[PDB]
Each structure stands twice: as structure tokens, then as C-alpha cells.
Ligand binder design. Structure first.
Ligand SMILES: CCC1NC2CC[C@@H](Cl)CN2C1C(=O)NCc1ccc(N2CCC(n3cc(C)c(=O)[nH]c3=O)CC2)cc1
Ligand SMILES: CC[C@@H]1N[C@@H]2CC[C@H](Cl)CN2[C@H]1C(=O)NCc1ccc(N2CCC(n3cc(C)c(=O)[nH]c3=O)CC2)cc1
Lengths: 191, 193
């Protein structure tokens, strides 16, 4: 089972990944985790992150350029994701493809029905063959240049809610910060 | 020996690569060639090509984004270049890193001493470790464009940056030649008997 944890920067996804992995292990499942972007592990991920801190000229000013770099990072991880899915009962991704749709749409002042989210679906799932997640979990809540942009994060949160409501990329579950990890594990993979 | 053929669009680099390969082979050297970008052979190059046809939203409007895609294509080709260099006496590249510096600088209305050309050198050679060429051959051509008599244009600016890159020895030794260059004499200069 492939589970993606999604939400805006500062939502607390890493903590939820840690707590959810512990709940799955308490239920007897083997778990692997993988975080995107793969900073330190791929050139595309490193350049993209650096661009959001102001490096690399005009790169960050292009929404589709940034989205393309994050997609190329994920493309280099296809074999890794497939390997983890064959070897372990549950694979939890800290951020996945929906992050690219949410931030790209929000930067362009688009909604989940706009061109950017559809472009991400086409390039990442259809063209690059990224494994489709069984669950996308939105951690809904009330430093690089995205994180400093309060309006951007607010718009991204709204796009995320729309993506979940429209079933973008697969089945979604929406949870809050107070979600109980044990019950969530039971919902995602009933005993 | 690793040789990169450089020049503006329409200069005739592919023809020069073919003629130089024949001259090296007539001189007893084995030759392999590789063209950049590797259109049709790498995801990065294919997305770049699509953006050059107007696809992918605002991707092409970022000079550094396009330069990054061409660098990522080349990064994925290091194993190939190293293999060709182990297998053949001469490896000739139809465009290489200097293309990225020239077109990036020209698009930004910069010269060879500007930020884009230094950034290309920093990322492609110093950071990604791409093989540095033994020779970069600039196929220089007339900058006159009959369509631009209304007036420099992108191609004209790129040609000027190229001339500066060659004069300053950017990335290594350069040789500047014209379309009428004799392939045998050029081969003898690049790899003396
Ligand atoms: C042969 C086709 C043409 N002949 C002429 C003659 C005159 C003009 Cl004005 C325009 N021309 C043509 C033209 O513009 N065709 C359209 C055209 C032609 C070529 C390009 N690329 C040029 C190289 C460039 N590049 C390459 C590498 C390896 C790199 O690392 N970095 C980089 O940036 C990519 C774009 C784009 C559009
Ligand atoms: C290190 C590090 C931490 C955070 C980021 N951002 C995450 C959100 C956002 N993001 C993410 C992904 C995976 C994507 O596909 N698209 C996208 O916009 C910007 C980067 C980067 C580095």
C-alpha cells in the first residue's frame, strides 16, 4: 500500500509520518518512508530547493519550470518507490505529486480544475509513470520563498482541499493535526 | 580526445562534425560523435524540445530553467561520453556546454563576462563534473540577417558572446574556423600526427 501525506509547509507532515509509521508497526506491518523533494539525493531536487532560496537566476519565477524540476526528481525515484512497495507492507511518502499540483495552481491563482493541476497529472502519472497512490492524506491546518509567502500558503491550502474533494490522482482522506494515528492506520489499512 | 563543435543556429555544425570525422578517420584515428541536446533520448531533452515548440506553460520564458534542462540532459550522458572516450581516439560533440553559456547570455542581453555564462561554468563543470573538452571549435559565420535590415537580434548576440568565449578561453582552449575550413588541416591542428 502506497500512502502520500500532503499539506502546506508547516502543517506537521513529518510528525504525522513518524506517528503513522509507528502505528502501522504496532499493528504488525512493515513500513518504509520516502520524502520529496529528495534534497541531497538528486540534482533536480537540489536545484529546485536552491532556486526557492534565490539561487539560479530567474528559475524560480517560472511556475512550470519549478514543477518540472520536482517532477524530474520524482521520475528518478520510480524504481525506488516500486522497490519499497514490493518489499514492505506500507510505504508512506512525505509529500508527493499532489504537492506539485497544489503549489503550481496556487502560484498561478488557479483552482484544482485549472490547467496546472491537469498538466501535473499528465506529466507525472501518465508520461513519467509515477506510481499512483492508494491513499492521499491531506493534513489540513489553519525558510524558502514559498514558506515566507503567507498568501501563497493560504491559496495552496485551498487548492489542496479542492484536489481532495475532486479525487485528484486517487482516493483522498482529510485529517487534522489532532488525528489519532492508530485510528488513521486502521482506516487506511483495516485489519 | 574530446572536441566540441560550437556556433549559432544554422552555422553548419553537423556538416562540420561529419567532415571532421572523415578527416580524422582518413588520418587513422577512430571517431565517435554525440549530439546535444540528446533529443529523443532523454526525458530532460524531450521536455526542453517541447518547450521550444511552445508547450509547458511558462517553462521556456525562464532562461535558467531551460539552461538547467540542457544541463540535466548532459548530466545523464556522462556515462556515454566516458564510454566513447575509452573506446575511440576522438569523440566529437555536436554542441556542448558552451552552447548553454552563449544562448543563455544572449537571451539575457549579457556578455561572456556576465552572470549567466559564469553560472553555466559553475553548475555544469564545477558542480556536475561534466567532462571538460580538450578543444572547443567555434564555427563562426556572418552575422548579417536579411530579415533584420529593419534595425542586435538573438542570433547576432549569441554569435558575439561566442566570439568572446573563444577569445577568453572559456572552459578550455578554443579554435575559431569558418565554413570553408579544410577538414584535413583542421584535424591535423586538433591532433597533430
Ligand atoms: C537551423 C534552424 C535555424 N536557423 C536559423 C538561422 C537564423 C535564425 Cl534568426 C534562426 N535560425 C534557426 C532557428 O532559430 N530555429 C529554431 C531553433 C533552433 C535551435 C534552437 N536551440 C538552439 C540550441 C540551444 N541550446 C543547445 C544546447 C546544447 C544547450 O546546452 N543550450 C541551448 O540553449 C537550444 C535551442 C532553438 C530554436
Ligand atoms: C527541503 C525542502 C523542503 C520543502 C520544499 N518544498 C516543498 C513544497 C513545495 N513542493 C514540493 C514538492 C514535492 C513538489 O512536487 N512541488 C512543490 O511545489 C516546494 C518545495 C523543498 C525542499
Amino acid at each position: 500500500m502506497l500512502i502520500a501525506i500532503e499539506g502546506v509547509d508547516g502543517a506537521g507532515k513529518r510528525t504525522l509520518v513518524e506517528k503513522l509509521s509507528g502505528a502501522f508497526r504496532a499493528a504488525g506491518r512493515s513500513v518504509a518512508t520516502l520524502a520529496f523533494p529528495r534534497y541531497g539525493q538528486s540534482v533536480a531536487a537540489d536545484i529546485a530547493a536552491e532556486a526557492l532560496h534565490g539561487e539560479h537566476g530567474d528559475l524560480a519565477s517560472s511556475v512550470y519550470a519549478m514543477a518540472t524540476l520536482f517532477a524530474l526528481d520524482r521520475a528518478g525515484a520510480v524504481h525506488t518507490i516500486q522497490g519499497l512497495c514490493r518489499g514492505y507492507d506500507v510505504v508512506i511518502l512525505d509529500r508527493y505529486v499532489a504537492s506539485n499540483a497544489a503549489y503550481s495552481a496556487a502560484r498561478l491563482h488557479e483552482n484544482a480544475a485549472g490547467k496546472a493541476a491537469a498538466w501535473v497529472q499528465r506529466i507525472e502519472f501518465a508520461r513519467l509513470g509515477l506510481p499512483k497512490p492508494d491513499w492521499q492524506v491531506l493534513l489540513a491546518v489553519s525558510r524558502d520563498n514559498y514558506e515566507r509567502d503567507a498568501e501563497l500558503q493560504q491559496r495552496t491550502g485551498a487548492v489542496y482541499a479542492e484536489l481532495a474533494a475532486q479525487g485528484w490522482g486517487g482516493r483522498w482522506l482529510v485529517v487534522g493535526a489532532d488525528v489519532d494515528p492508530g485510528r488513521l492506520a486502521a482506516t487506511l489499512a483495516p485489519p
